[PDB]
Amino acid sequence: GAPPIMGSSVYITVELAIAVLAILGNVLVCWAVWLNSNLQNVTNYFVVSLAAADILVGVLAIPFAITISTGFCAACHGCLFIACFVLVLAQSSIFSLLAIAIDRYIAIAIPLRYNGLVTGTRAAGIIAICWVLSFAIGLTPMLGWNNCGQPKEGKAHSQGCGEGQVACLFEDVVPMNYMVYFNFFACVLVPLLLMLGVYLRIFAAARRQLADLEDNWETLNDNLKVIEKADNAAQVKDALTKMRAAALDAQKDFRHGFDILVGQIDDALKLANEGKVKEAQAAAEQLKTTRNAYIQKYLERARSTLQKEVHAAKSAAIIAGLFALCWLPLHIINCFTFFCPDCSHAPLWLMYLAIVLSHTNSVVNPFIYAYRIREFRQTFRKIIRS
Ligand SMILES: Cc1c(C#N)cccc1-c1cc(-c2cn(Cc3cccc(C(C)(C)O)n3)nn2)nc(N)n1
Ligand SMILES: CC(C)CCC[C@@H](C)[C@H]1CC[C@H]2[C@@H]3CC=C4C[C@@H](O)CC[C@]4(C)[C@H]3CC[C@]12C
Ligand SMILES: CC(C)CCC[C@@H](C)[C@H]1CC[C@H]2[C@@H]3CC=C4C[C@@H](O)CC[C@]4(C)[C@H]3CC[C@]12C
Ligand SMILES: CC(C)CCC[C@@H](C)[C@H]1CC[C@H]2[C@@H]3CC=C4C[C@@H](O)CC[C@]4(C)[C@H]3CC[C@]12C
Ligand SMILES: CC(C)CCC[C@@H](C)[C@H]1CC[C@H]2[C@@H]3CC=C4C[C@@H](O)CC[C@]4(C)[C@H]3CC[C@]12C
Ligand SMILES: CCCCCCCC/C=C\CCCCCCCC(=O)OC[C@H](O)CO
Ligand SMILES: CCCCCCCC/C=C\CCCCCCCC(=O)OC[C@H](O)CO
Ligand SMILES: CCCCCCCC/C=C/CCCCCCCC(=O)O
Ligand SMILES: CCCCCCCC/C=C\CCCCCCCC(=O)O
Ligand code: NA
């Protein structure tokens, strides 16, 4: 049994290193959003709320975790607060991650009404509401779902604790049925699964819209070929009518290009209906000039916008997946403790790895933004250089 202060020194030193990096990186995120108006959008207000939670992991939750690792004597309800505050920050993170996913889904699924639906003032209200709900969820043990009514008196007496005091240890004061059924299953697992469903819908919507763009492009070029090798006016008419409905479907300098295109289709359709096949086919050949000068530029720009949305949704999904990767080990350990009382408790070294891993999640987001979002990376460079 090596002196506890030795392994404690390693744990504390690692925690302090994580706290420093979590503060510095997420302050940099908040500084970047404040300074750059290209970063001031609803999506990034949730990013800032998420960075604020991670700053508070460094400033408060990590000091609280160090404190409660000592088992020091404390009034049980005071011990509850330092045990549970991190649950508020994790819950706020969950709400921010879910909001980011939903925001990106609205942007990809109804972009025409996004800006009118998703506003900065509405985002700020949602963030306020989510922080209040995070306090209610994370501090629910302080409302009475706690073990303060059944203190471990032998542990308190062995440490010289005063009257009404307990040895302040997370698993002695926070009930494990709360941690497993309420916190993990209901408040963490269900929102993460909802996030997964939203991201699946985002990527499926992007895939469908890109396919729809390519289908309309092929229909345009296919029907032009049909007109060229048509042998009567009715065949020309058939292909032009299919082109006209498709042109309006793709319309839902951009406006000018489609105005020319639909007009040139109408010109050829009128000639077709007069039985002037050769003249209609010549009129339809003009469509190619409009296709090259206008329509192809719209196709490429629409594709480029969708691909950027896919890239941004992947970046956001990486953040959500890394949250799950960092927090799941601690939750899984709690499940073993709760569901398997015949199993030996996870060993002390694994406890400290799982706790430290959950704290490292507050370090990682600034790096994801830097490596994946040019506007962040460039703003980070300007802040650091200056
Ligand atoms: C909070 C949380 C969330 C959230 N939010 C989500 C899932 C799980 C947990 C969580 C957290 C902690 C815990 C313990 N400590 C202090 C500490 C540090 C080092 C060593 C020790 C020992 C020696 C074991 O007493 N104790 N900090 N967090 N313990 C447990 N079972 N679950
Ligand atoms: C906005 C920031 C500065 C507020 C930070 C306040 C923190 C550090 C304060 C607020 C409430 C405090 C706790 C309230 C009660 C107790 C019970 C006592 O037996 C031991 C200390 C302990 C556990 C306190 C530790 C410090 C504490 C967590
Ligand atoms: C920004 C301002 C409002 C600071 C926020 C105040 C918070 C940190 C303070 C105010 C009231 C405090 C609680 C007041 C009463 C008790 C009961 C006591 O047995 C232990 C501490 C405990 C459980 C305190 C925990 C921390 C607490 C919730
Ligand atoms: C999210 C990804 C990384 C999966 C994480 C898997 C981790 C958390 C799993 C894998 C194997 C698991 C261990 C397997 C067996 C035991 C023995 C038991 O007496 C206590 C729990 C303990 C020690 C488990 C703790 C959790 C554990 C370490
Ligand atoms: C989609 C995924 C990440 C959902 C989370 C998986 C969790 C809920 C699963 C994965 C492995 C599971 C554990 C595997 C083994 C045991 C040992 C048994 O004696 C009691 C239940 C217990 C402790 C399980 C509890 C639930 C568990 C922790
Ligand atoms: C880079 C930063 C430099 C930092 C410099 C060194 C950091 C650590 C110093 C002293 C540790 C004292 C720890 C306080 C007491 C620990 C209690 C303990 O070991 O846990 C027992 C409890 O009962 C659970 O079972
Ligand atoms: C915006 C925020 C700026 C900074 C805010 C401050 C940062 C937190 C520092 C330490 C937390 C740990 C505090 C708990 C210390 C407990 C020691 C203690 O009370 O021991 C005496 C005896 O155990 C009782 O009977
Ligand atoms: C775990 C406890 C959960 C608390 C349940 C109670 C829910 C209270 C909050 C509900 C969200 C409603 C927000 C309404 C604010 C006003 C919005 C508006 O004026 O348009
Ligand atoms: C920028 C603000 C950051 C706050 C700095 C706080 C850093 C201090 C870290 C941990 C405090 C640990 C308290 C130890 C508990 C007492 C031990 C005992 O009584 O046995
Ligand atoms: Na977080």
Give DSSP secondary structure letters for 175-210.
-HHIIIIIIIIIIIIHHHHHHHHHHHHHHHHHHHHH
* Nearest residue to 41 (alpha-carbon basis) of 106, 94, 88, 95: 106
The backbone torsions φ and ψ at residue 334, rounded to the nearest 5 degrees and listed phi first, read -60, -35
Kindly give the distance from the C-alpha atom of residue 69 to the centroid of ligand 3, in angstroms, as a whole number.
Answer: 21
Q: What is the resolution of this structure in A?
A: 2.1
Side chain identity at 213, as an amino acid letter? L
Residue 274: give its domain's CATH number: 1.20.120.10
**Helices 277-290 and 254-273: angle between axes, nearest 10 degrees:** 170
The backbone torsions φ and ψ at residue 41, rounded to the nearest 5 degrees and listed phi first, read -140, 170
Structural domain contains residue 23: yes
In terms of domains, do 146 and 201 share one? Answer: no
Q: Which of 60, 68, 70, 158 to mutate to test the pocket of ligand 9 (most atoms within 8 A of CB)?
A: 70
As a whole number of angstroms, the distance between CA 201 and CA 109 comes to: 9
Strand partners, 73: 167
Which value, to the nearest 10 degrees, does the dihedral of the CA atoms of residues 176, 178, 182, 184 take? -30
Q: Coil, strand or helix: which one is 87?
A: helix
As a whole number of angstroms, the distance between CA 380 and CA 268 comes to: 56
Question: Measuring CA to CA, how many Å separate 9 from each of 72, 131, 170, 234?
Answer: 16, 34, 19, 87
- Among residues 281, 297, 326, the one where a domain terminates is 326
Structural domain contains residue 43: yes
- Full DSSP string of 263-288: HHHHHHHHHHHTT-HHHHHHHHHHHH
Count H helices and E strands in the chain, helices first.
16, 2
As a whole number of angstroms, the distance between CA 48 and CA 25 comes to: 12
Kindly give the distance from the C-alpha atom of residue 82 to the centroid of ligand 2, in angstroms, as a whole number.
Answer: 7
Burial annotation 375-386 (CB, 10 A radius, 16+ → b, else e): ebeebbeeeeee
Q: Coil, strand or helix: which one is 119?
A: coil
Q: Find where tokens 């020319």 sit.
A: 260
Structural domain contains residue 276: yes
In terms of domains, do 240 and 354 share one? Answer: no
In terms of domains, do 243 and 354 share one? Answer: no
Residue 99: give its domain's CATH number: 1.20.1070.10
As a whole number of angstroms, the distance between CA 221 and CA 382 comes to: 47
Q: Coil, strand or helix: which one is 113?
A: helix
Structural domain contains residue 186: no
5 CB within 6 A, ligand 6: yes
List the domain range (segments joined by +) for residue 49: 4-174+347-385
Strand partners, 166: 74
What is the Cα gyration radius of the chain?
30
CB–CB of 287/258 below 8 Å?
no
Q: How many domains is the chain built from?
A: 2
Side chain identity at 206, as an amino acid letter? A
Structural domain contains residue 335: no
- Which stretches of the chain are assigned E, i.e. beta strand? 73-75, 165-167
In terms of domains, do 278 and 203 share one? Answer: yes
As a whole number of angstroms, the distance between CA 58 and CA 51 comes to: 11
In terms of domains, do 42 and 82 share one? Answer: yes
Kindly give the distance from the C-alpha atom of residue 323 to the centroid of ligand 4, in angstroms, as a whole number.
Answer: 18
Q: Exposure of 195 by Cβ count < 10 A (0-12 exposed, 13-18 middle, 19+ buried)?
A: buried
In terms of domains, do 239 and 296 share one? Answer: yes
In terms of domains, do 15 and 141 share one? Answer: yes
In terms of domains, do 20 and 58 share one? Answer: yes
Q: Are strands 165-167 and 73-75 parallel, antiparallel or unpaired?
A: antiparallel
Determined by: X-ray
* Nearest residue to 338 (alpha-carbon basis) of 181, 187, 173: 181
Strand partners, 165: 75
DSSP for residue 292? I
Q: Exposure of 77 by Cβ count < 10 A (0-12 exposed, 13-18 middle, 19+ buried)?
A: middle
Give the closest residue (by CA) to ligand 1 atom 21: 69
Give every CB contact of residue 1 below 8 A, 6+ residues apart in sequence: none
Give the closest residue (by CA) to ligand 8 atom 17: 125
For 212, the token pair is 């729809």
Side chain identity at 386, as an amino acid letter? S
Q: Coil, strand or helix: which one is 75?
A: strand
> Which residues line ligand 7 at a C-beta cut-off of 6 Å?
59-60, 63-64, 67, 72-74
As a whole number of angstroms, the distance between CA 52 and CA 112 comes to: 31
* Nearest residue to 67 (alpha-carbon basis) of 168, 176, 159: 168
For 96, the token pair is 């921010």
* Nearest residue to 29 (alpha-carbon basis) of 14, 44, 11, 43: 44
For 192, the token pair is 């993460």
140 CB within 6 A, ligand 9: no
DSSP for residue 291? I
Q: How many CB atoms lie within 10 A of CB 133?
A: 15
Give every CB contact of residue 226 below 8 A, 6+ residues apart in sequence: 235, 238, 239
In terms of domains, do 143 and 277 share one? Answer: no
In terms of domains, do 26 and 146 share one? Answer: yes
In terms of domains, do 25 and 168 share one? Answer: yes
60 CB within 6 A, ligand 3: no
Side chain identity at 166, as an amino acid letter? V
Structural domain contains residue 184: no
Question: Measuring CA to CA, how many Å separate 367 from each of 20, 364, 376?
Answer: 15, 5, 10
For 382, the token pair is 């300007």
Q: Count how many Cα atoms sit within 13 Å of the Cα of residue 87 in the half-sphere of its side chain.
A: 25
Q: How many CB atoms lie within 10 A of CB 89?
A: 21
In terms of domains, do 218 and 252 share one? Answer: yes
